[PDB]
Structures are given as C-alpha cells and as structure tokens.
Nucleic acid binder design. Sequence first.
RNA 1: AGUAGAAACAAGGGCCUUUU
Lengths: 51, 545, 552, 50, 710, 97
Amino acid sequence: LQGKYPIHYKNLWNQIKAAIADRTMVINENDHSEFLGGIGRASKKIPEISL
Amino acid sequence: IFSFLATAADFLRKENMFNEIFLPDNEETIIEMKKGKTFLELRDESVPLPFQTYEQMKDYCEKFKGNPRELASKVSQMQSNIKLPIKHYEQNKFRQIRLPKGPMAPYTHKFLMEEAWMFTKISDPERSRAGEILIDFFKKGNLSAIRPKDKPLQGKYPIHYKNLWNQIKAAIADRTMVINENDHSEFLGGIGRASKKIPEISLTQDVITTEGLKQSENKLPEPRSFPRWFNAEWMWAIKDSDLTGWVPMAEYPPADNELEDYAEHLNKTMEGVLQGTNCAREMGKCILTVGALMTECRLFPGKIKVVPIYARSKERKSMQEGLPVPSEMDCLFGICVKSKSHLNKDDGMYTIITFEFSIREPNLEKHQKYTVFEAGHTTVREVPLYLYCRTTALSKIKNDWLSKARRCFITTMDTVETICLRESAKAEENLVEKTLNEKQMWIGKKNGELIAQPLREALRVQLVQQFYFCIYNDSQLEGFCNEQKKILMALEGDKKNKSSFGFNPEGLLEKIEECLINNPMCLFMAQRLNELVIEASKRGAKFFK
Amino acid sequence: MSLLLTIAKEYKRLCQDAKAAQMMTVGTVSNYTTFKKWTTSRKEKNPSLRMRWAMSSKFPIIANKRMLEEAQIPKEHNNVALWEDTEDVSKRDHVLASASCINYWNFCGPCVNNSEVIKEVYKSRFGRLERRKEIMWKELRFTLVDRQRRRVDTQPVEQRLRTGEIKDLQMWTLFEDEAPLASKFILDNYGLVKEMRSKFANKPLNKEVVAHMLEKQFNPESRFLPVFGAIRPERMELIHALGGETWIQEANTAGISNVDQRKNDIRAVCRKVCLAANASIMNAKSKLVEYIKSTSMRIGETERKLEELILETDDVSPEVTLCKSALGGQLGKTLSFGPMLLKKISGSGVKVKDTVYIQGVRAVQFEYWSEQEEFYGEYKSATALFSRKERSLEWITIGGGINEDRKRLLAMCMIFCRDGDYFKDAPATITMADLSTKLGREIPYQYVMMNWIQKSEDNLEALLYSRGIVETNPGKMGSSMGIDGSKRAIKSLRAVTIQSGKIDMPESKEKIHLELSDNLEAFDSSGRIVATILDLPSDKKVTFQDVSFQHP
Amino acid sequence: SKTFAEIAEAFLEPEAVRIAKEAVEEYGDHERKIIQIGIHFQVCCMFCDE
Amino acid sequence: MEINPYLMFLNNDVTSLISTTYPYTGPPPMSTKYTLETIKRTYDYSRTSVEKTSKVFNIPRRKFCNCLEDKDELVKPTGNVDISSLLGLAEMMEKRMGEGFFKHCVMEAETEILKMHFSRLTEGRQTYDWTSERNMPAATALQLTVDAIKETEGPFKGTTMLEYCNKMIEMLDWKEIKFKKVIDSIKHDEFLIRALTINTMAKDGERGKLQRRAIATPGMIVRPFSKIVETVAQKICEKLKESGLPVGGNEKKAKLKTTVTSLNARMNSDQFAVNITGDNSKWNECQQPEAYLALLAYITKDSSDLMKDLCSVAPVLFCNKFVKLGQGIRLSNKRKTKEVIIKAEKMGKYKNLMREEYKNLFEPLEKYIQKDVCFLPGGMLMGMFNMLSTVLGVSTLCYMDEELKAKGCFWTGLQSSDDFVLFAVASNWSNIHWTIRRFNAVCKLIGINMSLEKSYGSLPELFEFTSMFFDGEFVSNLAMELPAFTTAGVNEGVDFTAAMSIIKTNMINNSLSPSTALMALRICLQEFRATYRVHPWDSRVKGGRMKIINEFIKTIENKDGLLIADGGKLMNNISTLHIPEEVLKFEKMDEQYRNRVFNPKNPFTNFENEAVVSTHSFRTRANRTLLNTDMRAMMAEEKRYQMVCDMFKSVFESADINPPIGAMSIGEAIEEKLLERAKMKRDIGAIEDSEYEEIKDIIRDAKKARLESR
Amino acid sequence: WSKADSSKIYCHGIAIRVPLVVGDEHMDTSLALLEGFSVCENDPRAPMVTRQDLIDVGFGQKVRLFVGQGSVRTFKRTASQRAASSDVNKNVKKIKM
RNA sequence: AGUAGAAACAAGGGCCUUUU
C-alpha cells in the first residue's frame, strides 16, 4: 500500500520463516540486511597521503 | 478411446499432419513425387557430359569411392600450370598514385561556405517561418537596396538571372513567394526541355534518314586536376564563427549515477567546442533550407516558389558584465528557388536556383559554374558587393540525408571517447581531460615540418572530414574509400614488422585510380595518402618514391 | 442484438454471391488464415523518408468515422483542421485525419473511468522499473574486463512454459466461448488460469494486445552475449548500464527476484530422489519415476508438479539430466564429469579396452576412446580448451583466474583423458575395497581416481607430477604454469598454455533423446556417458519448504 | 521437433514410441509411420484396461 | 599550413580509427549492358567450346562441367568443375564429422518439408509473375497462380507443400493454361519458357560490395524446391564450425578466437602461423548448378527415395534458366530534342544504329537469345544459393594430404559466402608459399577462384572479416550501424523505444560508449520531434500542434508526465533505455490525462514490437498513384477475401491469435455459432422470439442460397 | 484451503487434488465441471446447448456442443479417472515374457 | 542549361496524382 523497498522486506520475511524452520535464528545469506544496513552510509575511503 | 483420439486429432490438425501422409489407409501407403514426362526429358538432358542419363550419374555417385592419389596428382598438375605469383611488399614496393591531368576541379557544393556573406537580425519567437523572415529582412531595405547591372564578370545567360532576381523582388513585395511562368524561368527551370516520344509502330526508314536517330552516345564525365582551394576551405572551416548554437540540439535528461554524469559532461564539452565553428553554420543552413525545400516540394509542386537560404544562431556569452543573457539571431546568406518538383519517383530531379551574397571576387578555376554580378556596396565601413548565381538540382534522397547531418557528431564522439577510455583503462584512473588537453595529434605540415595540436582541437578535422563525406558522397568516393583500406593494412603491417605480401598490387592501384574523376574530395585524399606514405617511408618500408 | 441481425444480413448478402459462397463452402476454416495474407499486402523500402514526406501533408493519417461522430469530435476548436469526410481506397470505411486531431482527444475529449489495468498488461516492464528503483548504485571505475561470450537469459520470468501451453491459456482467460477442449495443463493449473482471468474480465480492452503481452510475460529472452561477473537475469536485462570493455559502474543487485533459490531447491530435490532410488538394486528406474510423480512443490502461490517444472528448466546438472532422461525428456548435448562441465567441439572415436594393476598384479579393465577430439571445459571461475588423442592429453589452454581452480580443472581433464602412468599402473594406496561396489555397484577407475584426488591434496600434486615437467623456455615464461598454478616460473609443466581472458563458450541449438541403464548411467547413441550418480555430492541434510512428498 | 519420434512423444507414451520404432525398423519402412502404429498400439493397451 | 587528416595513423593504431574512413554519414549512390557483360563473362569463364542441342527448345547448350580446356591464365576465373574432386572433398568432410551426418540432416529437413503449409511462400522478397510478366510480391503471385490452376482444371484442395510441388510438375506437362486478365490462354512451350524465366532487380539495399548492383527474382515454379534445398543446406551448415553464415556477431567472433587459441596451442616451437583476408570474385558466376545436382545426389543416397527426387529439381531448372533483358536501348538525335525508346526484342532489328560496343557484345549472343530473353544454361546469380556455396567452400578447409604432413604443414580457417579467412602453418616461408598454392589449386578445381588485388596476407594477428577488423582486441566499426539510430517511420509511440533498444544493443555488443549513446539519444529525439512536426511546451515555437497546447496547458499540475508527441520533455537515460516512456512517467501523469490516453476505445489505435499501444499508434495513409492506373480488377478479389475474413472474425474474435482448425467449412461454423448466440441471448438477454425467428429464417435462407448457387 | 486455489486441500502439509465435477459458490466460469464430462459417440438426437447451461445437465446424460471453431461434438457427464501411463506401462511389461 | 552514372530524369495519366 505504501512503502519503499518492499521486495527486500518480503524476501527477508521468507528467509526469517526459513531460519525458524531450521530451528536456528541465524541468517546466512547477507544481501538484503547488508543493503538495508548500508543505506545509511557506505562508501570507499582514500588515504590523505595518496592525495 | 474416443477422448484419446480426439486429443490426438486436435494436436495433429494443429501440426498440419492430419492428412493421408501420416494417417493413410491400407492402400494409400505409397507417397511419391508425380514424376511427369517433360521434367524427366529435361533431367536426362542437364546431366554432365560423360553421362547421358540421370541413372548413370546416380549409380556413379551412390557408389563413388575416394582415390586420394589421382586427386593429389590433378592437384599438383593444376598447381604447375598456374604459377600463382607471390609478392612480399618489402621487395616489391607500392608506387605513387597517378592523378589525372587537365583543368582543376571546381566548387560543387550547392551553397557557399567561405565566400558567403550574410545579413543578420534578431529573432522574434512569433515570426519564425521561412516566408516571414524573408520579408522582415526585406523591409529594412538592404535586400531591396541591391540592384545588379547587365555586365557580368563571368558566367552565361545573365539576362535571365537578372530578370529572375527582379521577379523575386517583386514577388517578395507582393507578400506571395510565387513566380509566374515566363520564357526566362522556363529556360532556367528546364520546364519544357523534356524529350518527346516517337513510337516505332509510327516509324519508317524515311523518318530515320530524315533526322538521324542513332543510339545515344553517352558522354561520360571528363577528368580534372588537383584542386588548390580545398585546403583553404578546410582551414577556414576550423575557426570560430563569432556565434554558436548554429545546429539545433535537444535537451539533456536527468542523471542518478556517475556514468550519466560523465556522459553529460563529455557531451557538453564536445558540443560547446563544436557549435562555434564555421562548418557548423553550414550544417545548420543545409538542414533548415533542405527542410523548407522538402516541405515546399511536398505542398506546392507544379509551382515555382521562393525559399530563403538562412540559419539561426546565438551570440556568444561574454562575462556577466555588460548586457547579460545574450540574444538570438537569424542570418540570411542568400535566396533559393525551386522548379516544379513533381517527384513522381525516388531518385528524381527538381531543378533549383541559388542567389547568394558575397564580398569576395571570384576565380575562373573555382567559381566556374557561377555567374557573378556587381551589385553595389554594404557596410560592416562600406565595401563592394557581389552576387554569385548558378543552377543545380536535388532529389528526395539528398534532401533526407542532408537534413540528417547530425551523424558527424556521433562518429567524432565515438572516436574520441574510445581513445580516452582506452588510455584511461591501461592505467585504471580517470584520464579524459588530460588526454584531451595533452595528447597531441599530428594535423599537417608547414615549412617542411610536421604540426601538432591537442585532440580537443583536432576533433574539428574529423568533423569536417565527416561533413565532406556527407556532402561530396558519390560512387567515386565510395570505391576510393573502399579500396584504400588495403594500403592502410599494409602500412600497419609495416609498422609492426609483419612481413606482408600480395598477389598483384598494380591492379589495386589501377582500380583505385580508375574512380578518381572530377570529384575534389577523392583527389585531395589521394594526394594526402601519397604524402602519408612518403612521410612514412622515412620510418617504414614497402613504398616507392 | 440488432448488430447480430446486421451480421446475419451481411452473411446473407455475401452468400448471395457465387465466389464468396464457393469459398465459404469449400474446404475447412483454416483457409481463413491463407485468405488473411492475399489481402492488404503493401510494404515500403525506407519508411523514414516516406514517413517524413507523408506527415508533412495536412491530413496524413487515416481514422474511423463513426467513432468521431459518436465522440462529438468537431472539425475545428480555434481554427485548426481536425479531419474531413472522405474514403481511403483500402479500408473504404475510414477517413483521412490530421496529427492535431490526436492532441485534441488527449487534452480535452472522451474521458474513461479507470486505466490501472495497464499495469497488469505490461507487468514485465513495470517489474523492470521496480527492480531498477530498488538498486543502490556505487562508484564508477575504469579498467579492462574479461567478458566471456555465452548463452543466457535476459528476462526474469516465473513459471516458464512452452508455446503449446500458452496458445490455450490465451483463450480460457479471454475467449472462453471459442475455447477448445480442456487440455491437461489447464486441469492441472486451475488457480493460475483463475487468477489471470479475474483481472481481464468485465473490462474494456483490446485482446490481441493482451495476448501478445502475455507471450512476452512467459518468454525468457535467450541471447548469446558477452558477460562479466555473476549471471542473473536481473543483471542481464540492464548489463548495458553496469560495465563495458573499459568501464564498470559498481552496484549491488543481489537481493532481488529470488530466482536461483528455486533452481537450487529443485536440484537438491533431484539429488535426494536420485539417491533414494539408488538405494534400490533392481527397480531404481520405476522407483525414481514413482518418487517423481508422487511429489509436488510450491512456486510463489501456486503448487506445481515436479515433472512439469523439470521439463521446463534448462539447468544442466547431473541430477536434472537423469530425471529428464527417465521422463523421456530431450535435452542438449552437454556432458558432466564430476563437478566440472564439458562440451565437445569436434572429433570422433569409439570405445577401447585396456587394463591396469592395482596392487602388485590385479588386472582391472578401464576403457578409453580412439581418434583426436577437441573439448571445452568449465570449472568454477576457470575455463579450458583441450584435446585428447589415444589415451593422452595432447594439448590444453586455460584462461581462468585462480590457481586452485586451474589445478583442479587440469587434474579432472587429465583424468577424463586417462593420461598418465597411473592409468597404466595404479598406486599402492588404492585397494580392492576402495575399488568399487559399496554394496555391489561397480565403479570405473575414473571416478575412483576422482575421489582419490578429492581426498587429499597430495594425490593431486602427485597426479600433476605424472604430467611431464620441463624448464620454462625463454619467451614462453608468461604462457606457462607451475605446480602451484603460477602464470610463470623457471620450470613448468608439459604441453600447457596460459592466458588472461576466459574462453568463449561454444553454442549449438541441438537436441538429443538419450536413455539410461538400471545403474543410473545415461547413454547417448554411443558408449559415452553424459551423467551418472557418482558425479554429484555424496549426501547432505536439508529441510525442504513448501513441498509435498506424497509417497510412503 | 526435428524428428517424428520427438513429435509423437508429445502426446504419446515414450514406451509405445520405442515399440513402434523397433517395429518399423523390423519392417524397414519409412519412419514417418511411427505415429499411426503407436496410436494403434496405445489403443490396444487402453483396450485391455487390466 | 597544409592539413593532412591521415598523420594520426603514425602515433596511433589503425583499427581504433578505421571507422573514420567509412563515408556512411552521407547518401549512397544508386539495365542490359550490365546483363550482357555478365552473360559474356559467364560464357567465357567456361573455358571450353563443347555444345549440344536441346531437343526441347532446339537451342545450343554449352556444357560447363568436367570439360576443362584453355588452361592459360588460370589465375583468372574459371567455371569448370571436376566432380571427382568435389565428391572426394565431401567424403573427407563427412569422415571428419562422422557417419550418419548427411542422412541425419536430410532427415531433419524432411521432418519439416512434409508438415509445411504452402502459404509460407508469401513471405520473402518479390518474385516474377508468369502472367503479367512483372515483379510483384510473393503473396499476389501465389494468389494468381492458384486462381489460374483453379480456372483451368479445378480448385487446389491441397494444404501442404508436396501437393503444390506435384501440381507444378503436372502443370509442366499440360497443353493449355488459363488465367484472368482484362482471360487469355497459352500453350505448353510458351508457359514453360515463361516459368523458367527469371528477372532482375536493382535494389542492392546494402552498400556492402559496390560490385553488387543487382539481384535475382525467379518465378513461382522454382520457389518451393529452392526452399527445400536451402533448408537442407542450413541443417548441414549449422553443424559445422568452419562456417559463419547463419550466425551473426558474437558467434563468429568466438569462433575465430577459439580457432586462434587452438592454432597457437597446436603448433610446436619450430612452426609459425600466417593469416589471409580473402575476397572471392565472380562467386555467382562460377558456381555451376550441375555440381550441386551431383553433390545432392551423393548426399541423398542413403535417405528415402522421396528426397532424392525433390532436391534434383531446382538444379536442373537453374541448368535450363532464362534471363530477362530490361528496358532495351534508348535512341536520340544530335540536339537530343526528340528521343525514341526501344525494347530488347527489337534490338535484333535496329542492331546497326547502335554503338560498335553494343554490336560486338550483342551479335555473338544472338543465337542463345530468344524474344527479350536469353537461354543461360549454367552459371548462377545473387541470393539464389548462399548456404550451399558456403558448404562447397568449407569442403576445402577440411582438406589434408600426405604431402602437407611430410613437411609439417596444415591450413584451416573460416569461410562465409565469397568471403573467407585462412590460417596456414609450416616451418619455413618456402613451404608457406607451396601450401598457399596448393590451397589455391584445390579451390580452382571447383570453380572457387580468388581475387589477387583485394586479397592480402600478414603475420597471424592482423586480418578483417565482414567489415570487422581483428587484432589483440576487437574493433566494432560502429559505422556499419549508423543508419540504424533513426526514426524507422512507423508511428510515434514506437520509433523512440526502438531507437533506445538499438542503442542498448550497440552498447552491449559494439562497445558503444556512454556519452556517444547519450548524444545519439538526443539526436534521435530531435529528429523525432522534427519529423512529426511536434515540439515541447516551454519552447517559444508557435504553430498548429503548439497552439492548443498552450491553450489547454493551464489545466495541468505537472508537465513531467506528458508524452513527447504531446509536448512532453525527455525523462530517460542510460539506466532507463530498457523502459518505454509511457511506463516510466505513469506515476507522474495527472489523473485526467492518463485515463484519456489509455482509454481503450480510440479511433486511430491499430496494433520486435516491444512497445506500448495508445492513440499514438496509428497507421499511415495509403498511396493513390494506382488510383489512375487500371489495376482495379485485381482489387476486387482482394476486397472479397477481406470481407469474408473480417466477417468470420466478427463472429470469431480469436481467429488471428489462434489459427482456426476443424472439419467444418466456414458457413457451417458461422451458422452454428450465430444460432448458439441467439439462443444464449434470447434465454436471458434482450431478444424477442420474433427477432430469434427472423434471424433463423435469414440464416436458413442464406444457407440454402449458398448450397444452391453451386 | 483458499478461494484462490479452490482445487487443492492441504492436510498436514500434504496437498490433495480435488476433481472438478461440480462448482460451488467460490469456483468460477464453467472450468470446474470439465473433469465430470467426456466425449462419446455422436448422437444427433441430443440437444445443442451453450457452455453456461452445461451445469443444468444430469449425471449420465448426453448433449451436443460446439468446441473451439468449426467443430461440433457430443459429450456425456461421466468421468474416467484412469490414465494411459499405467495401462501402457503394465501391458508392455506383459509382452517381454 | 543542369543532375548523375557507366542509365535515367529534365512530370504522368485520362480535369486528376507551408512556423525549431
């Protein structure tokens, strides 16, 4: 109805159900979580000496 | 059982196999081509020589066995009675090309580029059609101030041209871009000079003997010499034009990633560099004039019209000081006229006429076809005035292609971006501005020495090259540019110490020199190719002096 | 209604003629298709020039007449000509109309209640758009790229089907009155049809367009393209904006379209059932077929039968191959020797017998092929092009990027060609127990040496040493490979060439109908083996979700 | 496609396909007749009905 | 200063700039003299003089095959063939590829030829009708031939290709044929000659080789057999790796690269390789149709007895073909005021009032000549058989001998039609030369010559193939496709998406760079705006389309959702080339405008075609020059068929989507469906018993009339 | 179960395919009766009807009907659960002896 | 006149076939 990145949330919900089925709360694949955690800030870094 | 059969029948009917072929009865189980009588009579007649019936050939082919020894023997025999020559270029060098001899190749383009003079005004968005601006420029009085004289410096049929110019002025005054059919226009427009037909059923020997009706003796074009005015135009079309925005262009869309930013930046640099040249104004002129002429030919055939030769541009941008927001400008170089473009079929021809303005006296060799008149004076101070006038024609194809003259930009951008990206990848770093400002590209000779300028300024040479390819395109230039590649590949092989070879280079030189006739571009590029191989002989083999 | 009566009157008038009657009486209905071609046949060479010349006129288009009258479309608003009563020669029921007339309708004209149905008609392209919007771009860099050419899919599609399964679906959703007999695909996939039918029902629409769009919605566009990096349809659809020969626009696109998960699940299930049937000794064939038909799985919302998906996919794995063989499903000419991939380019041959002594004197038969044959080979992040000649690896070239993968590919290739002395005199370490017959099922020495290599790295090193070693001649230093897998050394292996840049995967649009044995080893009109059960992982435990193993 | 056998496999059981194939090979007749025979054979099967 | 464009070729490569030479930025350029010269060269390259006499036509028939004579200047073309060598090379190729190969291919072909419908002959380039003697499309020619067959003996009930072929065969043995016209009939000999007749067209759409300035146009009695032969040739060629004719682009590049890797890996340290760029000459003038017949007979030896008879038709037909002289000569006086026009059949009369060249070229070809046609018993033509010639050529690259190995020498390569590339290997130049001469000889033995001027060689990695120059890298010419980025000329919706798709394909394959793609996008946008006489809204332009724009613009909140054809701006870029604008702007469009544009009932809307449909998807006006010409009688039957088809479709809406099938005729289905709908409505819908009964009476009366008329 | 897929029943995760013989409130458009009908010998006496009145017939009755295009047949509301696989597979095993 | 090429146009049929 109203949202931004529905596909990530949906796939993540499926992965959550899968993990619970496996009796382990862990999530191995890191594609959606990585994105949604890096949306805030993520980039490279150049040393000052290489400037 | 019925359900299965229904499904199967539907499938087959869908596959077009629901016929006797796949579903025959007991009897109709022998399908065969209905070999008639005539077809057999022929098949037994088209057989190779040793056989005389298809049966013998079939029996010889179905049982044919391989005998490598006789095959090798015939191979060697044919290999001995041939004596295929092999010629390593290093030993057998390439002579220079032999250009034809005779008068010089004159100007051929419909419009003038270097000798062209134009009157300018400011553009109002309301009045923007061609039939309006041609009047706006007419009111101020300069277009009417012109008044040539009956004494031409050169040319022929000056009376017709003078009367036509007067009629043009009159029609403009009448606010109707139309002209009447008189003897003069009829002579200049080839109105009634179409052949008259004579059926053979109505023919006899007495008629033939009366007026000779032999087979037409085609008068192929005649040769020419090297033009000495081409380098002048090439050097003039490299400098600025005091304005820009000569060629209209669309807008740039938004951007979200670095890629589109890079693309937009580079495209802006190149477009800003190119829109200021002189070749650009000629491109825009051709575009707009051809658009107007095509519209007229589509709407008002069988009617002599009046179309201007104009263009639109924008004065350059000075600093914020002074008057900001520079204005636009409509420029007018001359007048054009069509003649009953009844384009019944593609490749047709509709004669036109060109009245252009200049301030530079002519040359007999170059401005051979024109018929110049001394008009008067014009300001800048006062200076004399000339009126170049000639006649020519066009067609649908040339119109459509000239209107589509914005491909040179694409080609040049491709070349440049390719070079820059290749240089940037070998080092894994953004090397584009440096490659444009630093990388030197040899562009000519002066005082027997070589000359060089960054790529940022050499783009103009490639742009003019593409424009000329678009202008002087013909079968001759086609064959030339198709047959010169061998020389370039041999040159590259020489640069890399690759021992190239060939079978008959003399024939290649002959084929090349065969398509060099009365087309300035071919002659110029051939002479330049000779100069190239000469200058490289100082650093490479496979070329004779 | 009255329209129906008019159609009847027209049919009567038309039958009154003789030729129309003869043609509507003779033959079947299919003739219509033919009649559809002899009419309205006219083309043009350069529609560009023609279009410009044509649109230049003052009424260049055609258009319906009654639709304009009903739409109260006038012939002017503030003095601009919109259409004029007249008749085109072809249609005879159309009138020449202006370009300005179209603009008139859109700006002010006949409004409609809603149009969101479009989003369903062109769902694939809105999906493209959404997938794009959910991307997080990154920096841009310049460098050279190793773009390998290969056949891939560019259109992400769920429930990929055939063509015969579509020509029917386009009817039960749109033209049900004109529907044919119910096919099995319908009776099986009922909910799918119901869904596709719920949206395009009781709507004003042009149906031909919908059918065309549905074809696109169920067509994976397969192309032979250069590619770099991972292989996923989500990327191939916009590869043009990710990298070229000299540039790369980094961007993360991993968490979208959830495609490869379905394929890996399918392959896991195939492996499971293959092992299960292998547990048998005399009916593994029928056991496997039963396990197949006794199983189903969920895709998104719908439940599909396994055997139906298997015949739609194109995963060339030693598991899917076996299944598709049991069900008589044709497939491509692609091999499989353990984890690696292989494909024959040219050559021929025939089986031949030879023997080897395992420990002391223990004769064991092993076979090998006769004349020279070329092969392309593909291991993880590594490519190779080699040739075999009479039980020997003649030459090989590699274009990979890793040392370990290079060495493993080389070893598996050497094995595939039975090159070396080990195949002439096996090592002492192996014994009759490791030979074969876990429970009776024999094993050719090939896979024996395979597992012997996978066991310890030192077996691999010894095997490589079995290949000739020499001193790296000058110049060839770059095109040389050591024992560790280094692009250059002072002493390198024999008959080897290295290079940077993968090999272009070959291509062939061919199909073959193969079979298999009671030991789960497929054959292709020859003594060659394309798949088996020894080339797959031994075993592993997994919990399958949304599956139905309706078998005891 | 590409062969009548693959076609027949579309709506027939591959078993009867192979059967009719071996049969036409026995009589050495044109392999375009795989279909009719397979159909007849399958009919016989579904006529037994166990 | 003096300015030379070519100096940049010193400090830079040549491939990365070769595009600069191609003058594809300008218009390209555009009889009987050409045809007569072609006939002469064909009769000459048949280096012999043996001749027979056809009992059918009573015409001299030079025999061009296994009759080689005049073994001088063999470097020049020759059209004589030694069948033995051809069969040997074919056998060697089969041996390489394995047994059961040709049989498998002919089987795959027969698997299609039988089920094929005879309506697939409508697709293709123009053909030469044998009634009006002019070049019409294939559909109309097929229609006329069928109508003639029917008017002669009876309607053609056939529905596949085989029956049509058998009917053609029978028609070659009839004695009187009828056909429609403003209803002339003809005899056997005249129809035979008029069927074997072939015409020429000066299209040569592609620039390519300027030498190509014509193309063939056979009749309708030769199309199906030609299709059969092309099908088998394709099934053969696809299996081979030494051919690149059917594939396009990346495929042949990968082929060449794999070949180069294999070469560099095979040759030892004491060997060196070489490349060659070849361009055969007179390809369509040396390929003899008799060798093709013998080869197809050798191929169709183990297959069924049916294919043996079909493949053998087109060869003999090309062995007895006639050519058509076009437009004759033109006569005129000195001043050129008057002008007479003359046709071919008359040139034999006024042969004295022509230039001496025409006389020397015409009088010799006066016995082979008949009325406005020549009896060419051999040779070939352009476009007729491309794949078969490619197969015949690849047979050479497969050659091997004891001598080549005694010296450690061997060649391979890759050939398409009249264009090949060679890779020879040996240990010394003295042997390289011998190998190349051996290759040239074996190619000469089958009429495959080579052009010594356009052909050159060099060290391994420097060559060209089909406008693609090859080195360590691969240079996309990028000018070969320059005409592609343009408004096709179909409608407004489409051209823009098509251009964006083309740009995407270029960027993917031809390595087109980003900024170049952006420039091309803007250029195509400008040309689109200019062609359809449309421009934006903020722009100062005033005009017809633009008047109402400024009028109604006040009603709009945001102009970002508008379309280009309705005064919209550009919202698209590299990352959005695979998305039409109609889809990208859907969220922005103000609500009212969106409903009007996608309102389904639109007057102009008329439906690869990866595009959206809307009001802008219109159809252009139709030409009217024919209005004056009396080509109207033919329009009648077309109008009849169209009425029938559109009525059937009015009844059945899915006729186009799903091809109709069944055992009923058209009238039966129509009647039954009408009654069904009538009942379905009268039961519940708004219909009266009176209306139902009236409909039923009308239908039964129409049925009675249909069955009574005939 | 769900109204979306009215042809399935989920018990303990396992799925069960319900035949299509009758159509209740949820099911849709005469696609839920097709497994109850079958083809039979043509009978010109039985009536010809539409695809919507097809629900008002009695189990075991006959009726003529129009199918697709240019095709008429006769149907009977009696099913046949047996397939050909088993019948072909089992019968072929009784021949290799 | 002119175009362009290795032949064709320089209207053809009986009145018809205007905005960067």
